[PDB]
């Protein structure tokens, strides 16, 4: 291909793609949205979401396929776990009283 | 250039609005986005509203501070450390209440 | 009202109105910068990631049900509600948990 795009917004966003590194670059915006009746999907090694306040999935389901890693765990309204559970390096209580 | 604003045959727009510093895209059916290296998004706030599900597809999800779930379900085991406190319910494993 | 980009390294951006697909393919890395928000409001959302997605905030809130295979917690938490564990052992610093026949 022969396209190229560099779209430099007055408000200083820029919309750009650079093919010798092959990165796509949008900055200096306030807000994305997108809205879609069926599905979204992202297709890629790595994700990264750098959110200094919260990522909510407001969904009846997340799925997580494989391993899912915490620093805390806040589970509100109960749950089911199957297999080897093993609890290590302080305290488990239930109801004030430790196991 | 300096703007985009599109409105295609099917209703969807796609557009920047620099007077909000906007980035929309709406009315479509589907996107998909397939990358070999990463893709970062790095936002104060991200919100996905899905009325169906959210599926990660992937070895592993890591958040690096709080997850708040309503219910959890663990499918193949796993390991907790630190404190753990348990209230509002009981704790049963294997099928009796312990 | 039309939208069919080619770069020089293959990659593309398009949108096709007859199915209402937007696609972005063939590049190596995506950044999307902003400084209030990014909404998706979409009834299913796929994240396909060979290697790893991480969810770096103050805070990940999931607002009814998480499923996962295996669960690792690395600095505590808390539970509340019932909950029912099934299918293997239950221990505690090293203490198998007298849930089953020993």
Known sequence: GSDALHIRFP???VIEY???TS???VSGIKTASVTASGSVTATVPVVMVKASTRVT???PEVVCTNRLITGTLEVQ???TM?????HTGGELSSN???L
């Open 11 to 13: 408000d200083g966003a």
């Open 18 to 20: 650079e093919p010798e």
């Open 23 to 25: 990165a796509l670059t």
């Open 57 to 59: 999935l407001d969904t």
């Open 77 to 79: 309204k109960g749950g």
């Open 82 to 86: 199957r297999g080897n559970i093993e």
């Open 96 to 98: 004030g009283k430790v």
